[PDB]
Ligand binder design. Structure first.
Ligand SMILES: [Ca+2]
Ligand SMILES: [Cl-]
Length: 370
């Protein structure tokens, strides 16, 4: 196995989804901050270059009609990562891609809150990507956490799956977003919500023939500014443990995250068109859209009838280890600190990555979600 970048259209063979239906019958949302005008040009470049049918898109202003929905330039690369990775992982088709755009001039943190709220109120997208996060203690301090958890709770109850990147700062989410802080560990919001699927990050190795080879923890160390780049994982200090996580014994009475993980290392990342230029990009901002595309295709295969799947993942994977690639090697800290991967569920990677063929067979036999 070796480390290299990957076209998004490769993610179905990597994660054993290529024999499954595509997401042609499922609508997918993406939460953005601001507009997506360049992103939509980049998406056209992507589908056209890959010879795929064009994607039906819609953009939704989720705040004031007088709000600021201008493009955030750096943001376009994130919405590019999300949209191209979703469509590739989905098998090259989604029913529609909805961009739920946060108002950049909204008061306090309410821009993003209103974007989550519109996706849930509309209840048109079955699966929604959130490649955004921040220190959960900061979200809690001004009441954002409480307000947004109510929204995600409504989403889960009505059968929508929010997928949220676990973070890119390893265990050091609340230390100025990623500077090593020794033994002080923290987690990201909204990944820490029990009402979303939290998606962590791996280093993906493939064979020369493109077969899955192995995954380790995503941890690419410090950048030139001294910031750690690694998969978020740990437990919430606020959120109680949901019933289904009781199967992970020896953990606190808190929401443990991530649930599952996919490719995140930049060194093994996705090739993404950004302002017209192909770039190799990682993060748990990649891992979450991979999951969203795979999950959307499982929804299509099941007439969009799968409910919020967290409890089903925990019962199925704990009893059926063949459903996942169990990550065993690496850590999500620095300097000897952080959590270590190991057998079964771990704090850097949760259960690991899904084998979609085996998961699809399991669902055909047993159903999924609640
Ligand atoms: Ca593991
Ligand atoms: Cl429960």
């Amino acid at each position: 196995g070796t480390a290299k970048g990957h076209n998004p259209t490769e993610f179905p063979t990597i994660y054993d989804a290529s024999s499954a239906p595509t997401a042609a019958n499922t609508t997918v949302g993406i939460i953005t901050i601001g507009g997506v005008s360049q992103t939509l040009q980049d998406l056209q470049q992507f589908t056209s270059a890959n010879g795929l049918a064009s994607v039906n898109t819609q953009t939704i202003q989720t705040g004031s009609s007088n709000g600021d929905y201008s493009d955030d330039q750096q943001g376009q690369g994130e919405w590019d990562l999300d949209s191209q990775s979703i469509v590739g992982s989905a098998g090259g088709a989604v029913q529609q891609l909805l961009f739920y755009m946060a108002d950049q001039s909204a008061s306090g943190n309410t821009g993003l809150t209103q974007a989550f709220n519109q996706a849930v109120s509309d209840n048109v997208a079955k699966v929604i990507n959130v490649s955004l996060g921040w220190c959960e203690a900061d979200a809690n301090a001004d009441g954002t956490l409480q307000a947004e958890d109510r929204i995600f709770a409504t989403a889960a109850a009505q059968g929508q799956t929010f997928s949220v990147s676990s973070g890119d700062e390893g265990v050091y989410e609340c230390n100025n977003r990623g500077y090593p802080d020794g033994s002080t560990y923290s987690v990201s919001w909204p990944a820490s919500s029990p009402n979303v699927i939290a998606v962590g990050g791996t280093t993906l190795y493939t064979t020369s023939a493109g077969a899955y080879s192995n995954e380790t923890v995503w941890n690419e160390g410090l950048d030139s500014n001294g910031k750690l780049w690694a998969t978020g994982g740990g437990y919430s200090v606020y959120e109680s443990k949901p019933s289904w996580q009781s199967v992970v014994s020896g953990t606190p009475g808190r929401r443990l995250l991530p649930d599952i993980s996919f490719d995140a290392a930049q060194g093994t990342g996705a090739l993404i068109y950004n302002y017209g230029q192909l770039q190799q990009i990682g993060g748990t901002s990649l891992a979450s859209p991979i999951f969203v595309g795979l999950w959307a295709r499982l929804q299509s295969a099941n007439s969009n009838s799968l409910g919020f799947p967290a409890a089903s993942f925990y019962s199925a994977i704990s009893s059926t280890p063949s459903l996942v690639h169990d990550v065993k090697s690496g850590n999500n800290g620095y300097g000897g600190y952080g959590y270590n991967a190991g057998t079964g569920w771990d704090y850097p990677t949760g259960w690991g990555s899904l084998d979609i063929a085996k998961l699809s067979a399991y669902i055909r036999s047993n159903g999924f979600g609640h």
